[PDB]
Design an enzyme around this catalytic site. Structure first.
Site, PDB file in Angstrom:
ATOM      1  N   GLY A 200      15.878 -34.498 -33.321  1.00 24.76           N
ATOM      2  CA  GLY A 200      15.139 -34.524 -32.253  1.00 24.76           C
ATOM      3  C   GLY A 200      14.734 -35.991 -31.423  1.00 24.76           C
ATOM      4  O   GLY A 200      15.741 -36.603 -31.576  1.00 24.76           O
ATOM      5  N   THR A 201      14.115 -35.922 -30.467  1.00 26.80           N
ATOM      6  CA  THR A 201      14.032 -36.936 -29.531  1.00 26.80           C
ATOM      7  C   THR A 201      13.460 -38.124 -30.155  1.00 26.80           C
ATOM      8  O   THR A 201      12.641 -37.859 -31.127  1.00 26.80           O
ATOM      9  CB  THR A 201      13.480 -36.704 -28.223  1.00 26.80           C
ATOM     10  N   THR A 202      13.678 -39.412 -29.552  1.00 25.36           N
ATOM     11  CA  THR A 202      13.087 -40.605 -30.256  1.00 25.36           C
ATOM     12  C   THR A 202      11.376 -40.768 -30.039  1.00 25.36           C
ATOM     13  O   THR A 202      10.941 -40.405 -28.811  1.00 25.36           O
ATOM     14  CB  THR A 202      13.751 -41.909 -29.674  1.00 25.36           C
TER      15      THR A 202
ATOM     16  N   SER B 255       8.990 -36.111 -34.000  1.00 26.08           N
ATOM     17  CA  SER B 255      10.207 -35.692 -33.676  1.00 26.08           C
ATOM     18  C   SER B 255      10.908 -34.603 -34.729  1.00 26.08           C
ATOM     19  O   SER B 255      10.484 -34.777 -35.935  1.00 26.08           O
ATOM     20  CB  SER B 255      11.192 -37.131 -33.896  1.00 26.08           C
TER      21      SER B 255
END
Ligand code: CL
Ligand code: MG
Lengths: 195, 231, 241, 240, 243, 250, 235, 111, 244
Positions: E29-31, E74
């Site tokens: 996932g994204t930060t 995330s």
């Protein structure tokens, strides 16, 4: 419903039941048969609250007929009456009890004996030589107490029954429009078409 | 491989294969386009027939007077989800005397789809939805995936060959967003967008399905000779 | 080989999922110790904060179950907190129903019975934890009762749990072989904590700062944990003799 | 509750559990049904691997569902009892609500419906039973004979057989039964039914049961000696 | 083998491989990050711009629980939403019975026990999210981070997703260089920087910054999104530091 | 969630074996030896207190358990399984008997109830069998003294004397030579201690042996006086000292 | 094993795709929709000559204005028909009107995907639902076990379906009479049937606005077979 | 004891013409001897060229109209935007009313 | 999820057999032989206990023969624990019937009820079947003396003489050879014991390895007596018939 009588003689059981159906003000019918055949040698007459009577009688009939098919065997009158009593004894503590009183007349083919059982809506069972429900006993029992013999023929039983019906027609306020009479013996159930 | 027997099983790389297979059913479905301006929002859908004797499968479902969607994938799953949206839109109107916000409608669809991805026995939804609507914050377009992911967009497309329509909209972004107070020109842009996903077949009178919702426009669906104007 | 995935018997009469839950017990790499004084029960445990981004005050494997009962856990924190919440609920319910505070040994039995159920029922997994309960019971006095994933439990004179439990166990065994009594013959709990820390230092062969330990103390009518500064005072006393 | 889908489709579009239920029927003792002009006869095989049997009390192969309808079967005996009980209850329930006994077609449809339900309900396997249901509708003199099977399909038959070696006795019936002129009497119908079983049975002794159903609830099971007279007469004509 | 095919099965190591596979979804996932400041907390997240067609500022990722708790995560976004919905139910029932808003440590255990419960049975899948959350209560500011296993701890700074190593290193500098503490307005600026620095792991696509905060002085202990001039100021501060 | 294991985990294999029951019996075989001997005027049950650590207080772990005032139980196999069975057995003695008839159940019927619980773990959904064999000793007015064994399958048998677990085969041979129908209770205790010494490796004393009897009524253990018909429990656990006294006359 | 509600890697439900294979084994059913009515016809396919073929009921009445033909595991159709009949009658009870043919079809198709671990498997039967209403006139629908339904001018299902559908492609036009449609169903059934077509192994039916749904007598169908034979011999 | 019913007064009147229909109602709402409102609309356009009024207990009246309006909406969804005819509306309302046979809507409805 | 571990106890094989029923019958074939023989004046039930010990308390032991009511008894072959579950169910059914109709339950009605319970475990619920075969010996006033058997499939049949458990093939051949219809109880007693004596896997047939029971109208006048034989009484009948 009103008057239901029963008498057990030597070799048969005789059940008399009124023909009137009254809904309050009017007599809607004067030929009503207040009885169901439970098995070939067992007859049940009934009286009580409208609707519940027929609903209960047909429900019992269905259950005994089911037993007969399953086992290929007719239950004894004693066994049928015990089944019926339990159903009423279960019913009395229900949400809405069956308000039905019954007489069960049967000929036991094993013992070669007629048998008459009286069961009220509470599930109160007694075997009797003669019985009734409601106010019918009040008028008729004094006559039956006097004239009844255990060795009576079917014809004598019908004559004693006529005397009972005459006393009812004299002293009862309600017109019950006569009775349908049925005999239960070794040969099965038949209706006396002239009474 | 060994981790695609059910939805309750992660793979060793953290993938949910049953969800990804449900996503594949959308790619097999017929193309549908969504786009909007500040005043109106449009759905354009290429309907698919079984053969020449058959009808063309309906793609657009109305959810309320101010909201509706187009589908791509398993049509019965779209019926289940659109029925749920109808109920939620209706609950909002009856209880709160309030038209359901399109953003909130997306959130409800996400959460409904999610429960089917974390429990044993069930299965993911096998359909993708494009929801358009006009609410108290203007025109909206949503893209629903049965993974649960819902996204608010200016324009998009889903189904087979949808990438062609999606690139066109990505070029046309600055033009079609400005088409305010002109429903016909916004539909023209949607019809031109869906044309970038056609091969061999072209847009006929019983092939094309268009829907529109806007400022003083209830959600309405156009089929048959009502879309001949745009062919 | 699905007899290794769920809690059913292997051909040897073994439950492999129970055995593997025992292995999960040492995943934290933390050693605990418990001892009994005259008037108290002391439990110590190693504290390891490997990340500088962690708030060290929230890193704990000691739990205040009831006013009287404390619990140290050897195992992962999710399963530890699962067991903690349950033990707390059970202890509270017991008091409500029966009108007196739940004894330490009774709570241990209850949690052990729950653990047993997970070894018999397939849908529930064992918790990968060992639970050491401590109190000063109003009838039995200083008490240490320990529960494991098999559903086993027993009372202890003293006990140790973790990767290096055997070294601590043998160290304690040897001390009680000398003194010939079932407890630390000491009046104050402060000196019983000093005993506990000293014998862990001897057994493990490592020195401790104030932040390397975590201490719980049970006395009559309360269980409490020591702050870093309370532990520091304890470490100073050890070093000065 | 146990919810597991036991009856499911396979890649070739077959429900194997239903098909394996038919294999249980194939193992069962042979049963045959033949309708005449004014009667239906149900014949049933009794395997003679079991002697020292008490034939008075042993469950008979033909069961009365009501006074006017009978049911015989091939397959799992224990499974058949569950269908027979349900059928008997439904027969009394129908009399109670409609004030008329079941038609043979209705009773068949009900039993077949139960069988079907057990092919797409969770946690249950199909019945390993095919039935022959025979009788006469109330106040009707047209003979009725139906067949059901584990899948739940049912249909009416001029004559039919089920169970082990039913392929052979169906072969016999297909050449020997004429539709334009069915067995005109009880004698002819019973004879054709005994003849059909003699293609498969072994000894004609206690291995053949025969039940005759006539209109107006007239059902009787033939005895050993009565059947033995048919067996005797058939082979004496055959010696020619 | 086969120990990784079913949730709640201990391997011979004593490990639950399905939980470890859920972590891989988180790492994909994204930060997202969290910074504990003097009188509150700051949350920030990286939102990847997949296409020009995404409406700017509309696809909001950070979620409020009650009025005083922020949550960011995330991994699988729907799983995060499901967890927050539960969190909202827990926070509602707590307030219903006890009147006071749910304390942050109390709230942390409510999520923790729920996530842990999804590692007890094979009929459920573990959560495919790590969640960073916190806020202000009667005892002050609290920041937490909760993993797929149900494990959570309190943090000074927290980070998860694809750029977590980068972010963690940046957070560790802030802890060392500010033992006395960080202000809320400083923490917003630093949060912007850290997401911009952590965007090197997702450098292919451009991104949109989203920040929120609870602070006793700056927001009255309520969760609010950073918007307009304060957001642009943090973006400018972040852009200046990368160049 | 929900328990989605609604199916049997114990099933018949092609050879007619119930695997899980056999494996449960294997777990019982690995367990520590326990035994029971019936005398004319009593019954004795005994086992070794195999202490897992010397720091453990083995008095807190009761291998021999009172079920009713006149019935006791000992086991071989998995201790936790035994502990929960004792809890269920104590409760069922009340719910299915004492709350109905106003008296404690006879030994054979309590055994029957425990057996039923163990049978259900062998057929019910999503559970394994119990990994214990029980020896239940008891007295009641109309049956006198009795001793029963209960296996993981739920099957139970009455015994004059028997042994289960580790060294049961050797112990049963030892008991066959010594047992007669004229044994007094003290003679049975003596034989029990002799038999148990063979299967014990290490220390053999009152602190490493757990032994209880079903014998005479103990009015001193009743806790109250004033009701002539209540004469006290027949179950008595022997003390550490009482065992050691009989080890000198060994 | 594997879930009953599992998706294949292609994005299809295994069980639904397998039930479609069972339908291919089923006996042929054909429907043709005209402006004068819709015709439904089926192959009976009796397994033996002793089976009384008039007891084979593969064409069924749902209401007076809606008929239905089936193909596949025909036992599975009984609960679908029961639901359809109930839905038709129930809607009349609630709204004092006939139910739309599409709405009836949709109601039946809602049952289709209610399977899992509700019923244990999909239906193994396809239905042709034909009818008339005031809003959309004469209609023919094809209801599958996928839950999908298509409207058709003409449609064939069962074992001879792709051969029959190709024939219906050429023969159907918007000006067909009812009589022309009857012969056309008989012609195409005769083409794809194993056995030789007659009044005892094939059945016709129709739905008209005036007379409603009617299953044709064997005597009526026999005349239409004789009329067919003569007009094919006519060129 | 709690009485779930009340009487909000009012009077309504429907007349069917040859090619038209009127449904009229007073706008006064009352309890006992007090006026609640001098203008509280009682006759409602329900869509599909149908007008409705449920006069008596205003809470039950508003509930019924709300449910019928909702029934019209779902009739459109379920039956391809078909116009609900007045006879079909009437039968549908019977079922709404009879559904509460043992806790009735205390209103006299006219459409 | 959980499906992975499900044995599926209620499915057909490709040949149309019930796996678990077949395997339960295989279990039963290793159980001690039980024999029932029906005579004109009574019924005999004889059964072999499995390899006993000298330390087994025989006089208080019951593994084979159980009383269902005053008129009906059963002989068990298979898992004893399983049998006791069913036996208690049967005992209740008999009393339910007695309470309802005020008549003792006919033997077949009891047998059918138990057999239907066994059938249920083969068709639904996903549980293993009961690994038990029964021989029912009983009397009622309709059919008189009756012998039945039921097995894990739930199928039941009536018999003049029958065996269940081990060596039924050998036992049934011996019974078929020496049984006659006019036989009496004292003769049937002898036949049952002689049959067990020949089919036993033990070296010799002794009193301590047997359970024995008779249902006789040898009860004073028009009534039926059940006699579960004591250890000493089995010893006496073994000497009387000339086996020991
Ligand atoms: Cl407990
Ligand atoms: Mg488990």
């Amino acid at each position: 419903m009103d008057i239901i009588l029963g008498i057990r003689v030597q070799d048969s059981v005789i059940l008399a039941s009124s023909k009137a159906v009254t809904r309050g003000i009017s007599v809607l019918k004067d030929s009503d048969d207040k009885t169901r055949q439970l098995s070939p040698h067992t007859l049940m007459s009934f009286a009580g609250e409208a609707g519940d009577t027929v609903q209960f009688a047909e429900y019992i009939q269905a259950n005994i007929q089911l037993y007969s098919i399953r086992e290929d065997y007719e239950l004894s009158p004693q066994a049928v009456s015990s089944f019926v009593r339990q159903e009423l004894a279960k019913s009395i503590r229900s949400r809405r009890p069956y308000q039905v009183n019954v007489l069960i007349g049967g000929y036991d083919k094993k013992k070669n004996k007629p048998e008459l059982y009286q069961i009220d809506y509470l599930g109160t069972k007694v075997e009797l030589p003669y019985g009734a429900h409601g106010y019918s006993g009040f008028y008729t029992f004094s006559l039956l107490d006097h004239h009844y013999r255990p060795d009576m023929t079917t014809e004598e039983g019908l004559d004693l029954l006529k005397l009972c019906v005459q006393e009812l027609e004299k002293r009862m306020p309600m017109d019950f429009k006569g009775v349908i009479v049925k005999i239960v013996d070794k040969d099965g159930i038949r209706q006396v078409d002239d009474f | 491989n060994n981790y695609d027997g059910d939805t309750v099983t992660f793979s060793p790389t953290g993938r949910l294969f049953q969800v990804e297979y449900a996503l594949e059913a959308i790619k097999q479905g017929s193309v549908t386009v969504g786009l909007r301006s500040n005043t109106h929002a449009v759905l354009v859908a290429l309907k698919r027939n079984a053969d020449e004797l058959s009808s063309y499968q309906k793609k657009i479902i109305k959810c309320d007077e101010h909201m509706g969607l187009s589908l791509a994938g398993l049509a019965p799953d779209a019926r289940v989800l659109s029925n749920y949206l109808r109920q939620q839109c209706n609950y909002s109107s009856l209880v709160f005397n309030r038209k359901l916000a399109v953003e909130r409608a997306g959130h409800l669809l996400c959460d409904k789809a999610q429960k089917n991805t974390q429990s044993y026995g069930g299965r993911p939804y096998g359909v993708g939805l494009l929801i358009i609507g006009y609410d108290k914050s203007g025109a909206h377009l949503l893209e629903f995936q049965p993974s649960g992911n819902v996204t608010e967009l200016y324009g998009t497309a889903i189904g087979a060959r949808s990438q062609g329509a999606k690139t066109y909209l990505e070029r046309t972004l600055d033009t079609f967003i400005k088409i305010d107070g002109n429903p016909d020109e916004l539909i023209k842009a949607g019809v031109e967008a869906i044309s970038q996903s056609l091969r061999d077949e072209s847009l006929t009178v019983d092939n094309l399905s268009i829907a529109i919702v806007g400022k003083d426009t209830p959600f309405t669906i156009y089929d048959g000779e009502a879309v001949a104007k745009y062919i | 080989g699905y007899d290794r995935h769920i809690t059913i018997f292997s051909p040897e009469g073994r439950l492999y999922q129970v055995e593997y839950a025992f292995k999960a017990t040492n995943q934290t790499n933390i050693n605990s110790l418990a001892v009994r004084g005259k008037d108290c029960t002391v439990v110590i445990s190693q504290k390891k904060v490997p990340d500088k981004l962690l708030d060290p005050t929230t890193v704990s494997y000691i739990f205040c179950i009831s006013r009287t009962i404390g619990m140290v856990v050897n195992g992962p924190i999710p399963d530890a907190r699962n067991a903690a919440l349950r033990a707390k609920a059970e202890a509270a319910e017991f008091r409500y129903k029966y009108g007196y505070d739940m004894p330490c040994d009774v709570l241990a039995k209850r949690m052990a019975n729950l653990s047993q159920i997970y070894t018999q029922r397939a849908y529930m997994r064992p918790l990968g934890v060992i639970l050491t309960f401590v109190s000063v019971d109003e009838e039995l006095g200083p008490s240490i009762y320990k529960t494991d994933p098999a559903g086993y439990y027993v009372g202890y004179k003293a006990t140790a749990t973790g990767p290096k439990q055997q070294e601590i166990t043998t160290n304690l065994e040897n001390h009680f072989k000398k003194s010939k009594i079932d407890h630390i013959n000491e009046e104050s709990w402060e000196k019983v904590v000093e005993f506990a820390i000293t014998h862990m230092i001897d057994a493990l062969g490592t020195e401790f700062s104030k932040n390397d330990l975590e201490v719980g103390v049970a006395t009559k009518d309360k269980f409490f944990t020591l702050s870093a500064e309370n532990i520091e005072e304890r470490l100073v006393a050890i070093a000065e003799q | 509750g146990y919810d597991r889908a036991l009856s499911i489709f396979s890649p070739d579009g077959h429900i194997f559990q239903v098909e394996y239920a038919l294999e249980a029927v194939k193992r069962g003792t042979c049963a045959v049904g033949v309708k005449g002009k004014n009667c239906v006869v149900l014949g049933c095989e009794r395997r003679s691997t079991l002697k020292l049997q008490d034939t008075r009390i042993t469950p008979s192969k033909v069961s009365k569902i009501d006074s006017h309808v009978v049911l015989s079967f091939s397959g799992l005996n224990a499974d058949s009892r569950i269908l027979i009980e349900k059928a008997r209850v439904e027969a009394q329930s129908h009399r109670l609500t409609l004030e008329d006994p079941v038609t043979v077609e209705y009773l068949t449809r009900y039993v077949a419906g139960v069988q079907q339900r057990y092919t797409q309900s969770g946690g249950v396997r199909p019945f390993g039973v095919s039935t022959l249901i025979a009788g006469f509708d109330p106040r009707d003199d047209e003979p009725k004979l139906y067949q059901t099977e584990p899948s739940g399909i049912y249909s009416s038959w001029s004559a039919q057989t089920i169970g082990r070696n039913s392929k052979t006795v169906r072969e016999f019936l297909e050449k020997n039964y004429d539709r334009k002129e069915p067995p005109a009497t009880v004698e002819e119908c019973v004879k054709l039914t005994v003849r059909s079983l003699l293609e498969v049975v072994q000894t004609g002794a206690k291995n053949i049961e025969i039940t005759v159903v006539k209109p107006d609830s007239d059902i009787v099971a033939l005895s050993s000696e009565e059947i033995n007279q048919y067996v005797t007469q058939i082979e004496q004509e055959k010696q020619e | 083998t086969g120990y990784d095919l079913s949730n709640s099965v201990f391997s011979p190591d004593g490990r639950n491989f399905q939980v470890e596979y859920a972590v891989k979804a988180v790492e994909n996932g994204t930060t997202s990050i969290g910074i504990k400041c003097n009188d509150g907390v700051v949350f920030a997240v990286e939102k990847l711009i997949t296409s020009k067609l995404l409406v700017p500022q509309k696809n909001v990722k950070i979620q409020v629980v009650d009025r005083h708790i922020g949550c960011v995560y995330s991994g699988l976004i729907p799983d995060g939403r499901h967890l927050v919905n539960r969190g909202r139910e827990e926070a509602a029932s707590f307030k219903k019975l006890y009147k006071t808003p749910i304390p942050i440590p109390a709230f942390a255990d409510r999520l923790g026990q729920y996530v842990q419960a999804h590692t007890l049975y094979n009929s459920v899948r573990p959560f495919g999210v790590s969640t960073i959350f916190g806020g202000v209560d009667k005892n002050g500011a609290h920041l937490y981070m909760l993993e797929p296993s149900g494990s959570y701890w309190g943090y000074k700074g927290a980070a998860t997703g694809k750029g977590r190593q980068s972010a963690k290193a940046e957070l560790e500098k802030l802890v060392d260089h500010h033992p006395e503490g960080l202000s809320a307005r400083e923490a917003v600026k630093q949060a912007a920087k850290i997401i911009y620095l952590a965007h090197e792991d997702n450098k292919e696509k451009d991104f949109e910054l989203e920040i929120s905060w609870c602070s006793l002085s700056e927001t009255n202990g309520l969760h609010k999104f950073v918007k307009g001039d304060l957001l642009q100021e943090a973006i400018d501060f972040a852009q200046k530091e990368i160049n | 969630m929900t328990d989605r294991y609604s199916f049997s985990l114990t099933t018949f294999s092609p050879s007619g074996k119930l695997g899980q029951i056999d494996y449960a019996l294997t777990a019982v075989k690995q367990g520590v030896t326990s035994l029971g001997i019936k005398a004319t005027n009593g019954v004795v049950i005994a086992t070794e207190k195999k202490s897992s650590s010397p720091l453990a207080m083995s008095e807190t772990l009761s291998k021999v358990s009172l079920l009713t005032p006149d019935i006791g139980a000992v086991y071989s196999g998995m201790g936790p399984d035994y502990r929960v069975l004792v809890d269920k057995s104590r409760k069922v003695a009340h719910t299915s008997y004492k709350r109905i008839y106003g008296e404690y159940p006879p030994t054979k019927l309590l055994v029957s109830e425990v057996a039923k619980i163990m049978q259900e773990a062998t057929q019910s959904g999503g559970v394994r069998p119990f990994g214990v064999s029980l020896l239940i000793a008891g007295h009641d007015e109309f049956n006198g003294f009795s001793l029963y064994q209960v296996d993981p399958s739920g099957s139970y048998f009455p015994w004059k004397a028997t042994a289960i677990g580790k060294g049961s085969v050797a112990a049963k041979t030892f008991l066959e030579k010594r047992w007669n129908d004229e044994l007094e209770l003290e003679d049975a205790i003596h034989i029990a201690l002799l038999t148990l010494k063979e299967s014990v490796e290490g220390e053999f004393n009152g602190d490493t042996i757990e032994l209880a009897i079903i014998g005479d009524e103990n009015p001193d253990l009743l806790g109250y006086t004033g009701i002539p018909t209540d004469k006290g429990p027949r179950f008595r656990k022997l003390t550490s000292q009482e065992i050691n006294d009989r080890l000198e006359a060994l | 094993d594997r879930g009953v509600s599992t998706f294949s890697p292609e994005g299809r439900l295994f069980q639904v795709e397998y039930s479609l294979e069972a339908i291919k084994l089923g006996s042929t059913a054909i429907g043709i929709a005209t402006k004068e009515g819709v015709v439904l016809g089926v192959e009976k396919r009796a397994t033996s000559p002793l089976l009384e073929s008039d007891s084979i009921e593969k064409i069924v009445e749902i209401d007076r204005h809606i008929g239905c033909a089936m193909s596949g595991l025909t036992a599975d159709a009984r609960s679908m028909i029961e639901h359809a009949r109930t839905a038709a009658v129930t809607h009349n009870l609630y709204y004092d009107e006939d139910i739309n043919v599409e709405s009836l079809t949709q109601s039946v198709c809602d049952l289709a995907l209610r399977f899992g671990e509700l019923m244990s498997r999909p239906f193994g039967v396809a239905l042709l639902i034909a009818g008339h209403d005031a809003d959309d006139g004469y209609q023919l629908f094809h209801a599958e076990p996928s839950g999908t339904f298509y409207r058709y001018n003409a449609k064939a299902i069962g074992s001879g379906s792709e051969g029959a559908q190709a024939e219906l492609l050429n023969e159907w036009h918007s000006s067909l009479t009812l009589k022309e449609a009857e012969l056309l169903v008989l012609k195409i059934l005769k083409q794809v049937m194993e056995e030789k077509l007659d009044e005892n192994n094939a059945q016709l039916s129709c739905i008209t606005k005036q007379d409603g749904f009617k299953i044709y007598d064997n005597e009526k169908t026999a005349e239409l077979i004789k009329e067919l034979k003569e007009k094919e011999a006519a060129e | 004891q709690f009485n779930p019913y009340g009487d909000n007064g009012g009077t309504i009147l429907g007349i069917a013409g040859e090619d038209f229909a009127v449904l009229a109602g007073d706008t006064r709402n009352i309890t006992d001897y007090s006026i609640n409102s001098r203008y509280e609309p009682k006759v409602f356009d329900c869509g599909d060229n149908i007008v409705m009024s449920a006069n008596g207990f205003a809470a039950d009246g508003d509930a019924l109209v709300k449910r019928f309006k909702n029934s019209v909406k779902w009739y459109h969804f379920d039956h391809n935007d078909k116009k609900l005819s007045i006879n079909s509306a009437a039968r549908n309302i019977q079922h709404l009313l009879y559904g509460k046979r043992f806790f009735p809507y205390y209103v006299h409805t006219i459409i | 999820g959980s499906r992975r571990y499900d044995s599926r106890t209620t499915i057909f094989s490709p040949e149309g057999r019930l796996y678990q029923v077949e395997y339960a019958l295989e279990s039963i074939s290793h159980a001690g032989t039980a024999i029932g023989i029906m005579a004109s004046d009574g019924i005999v039930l004889a059964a072999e206990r499995k390899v006993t010990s000298t330390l087994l308390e025989q006089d208080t032991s019951t593994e084979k023969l159980y009383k269902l009511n005053d008129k009906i008894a059963v002989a068990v072959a298979g898992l004893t624990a399983d049998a006791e579950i069913l036996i208690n169910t049967a005992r209740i059914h008999a009393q339910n019937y007695l309470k309802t109709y005020n008549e003792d339950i006919p033997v077949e009605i009891l047998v059918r009820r138990l057999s239907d319970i066994k059938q249920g475990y083969t068709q639904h619920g996903g549980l293993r079947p009961f690994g038990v075969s029964f021989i029912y010996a009983g009397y009622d006033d309709r059919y008189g003396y009756q012998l039945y058997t039921s097995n894990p499939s739930g199928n039941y049949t009536g018999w003049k003489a029958i065996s269940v458990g081990a060596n039924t093939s050998a036992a049934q051949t011996l019974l078929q050879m020496d049984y006659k219809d006019d036989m009496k109880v004292d003769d049937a007693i002898e036949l049952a014991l002689k049959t067990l004596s020949k089919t036993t896997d033990s070296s010799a047939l002794t009193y301590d390895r047997l359970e024995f029971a008779t249902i006789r109208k040898g009860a004073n006048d028009g009534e039926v007596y059940q006699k579960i034989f004591k250890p000493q009484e089995i010893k006496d009948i073994l000497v009387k018939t000339g086996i020991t």
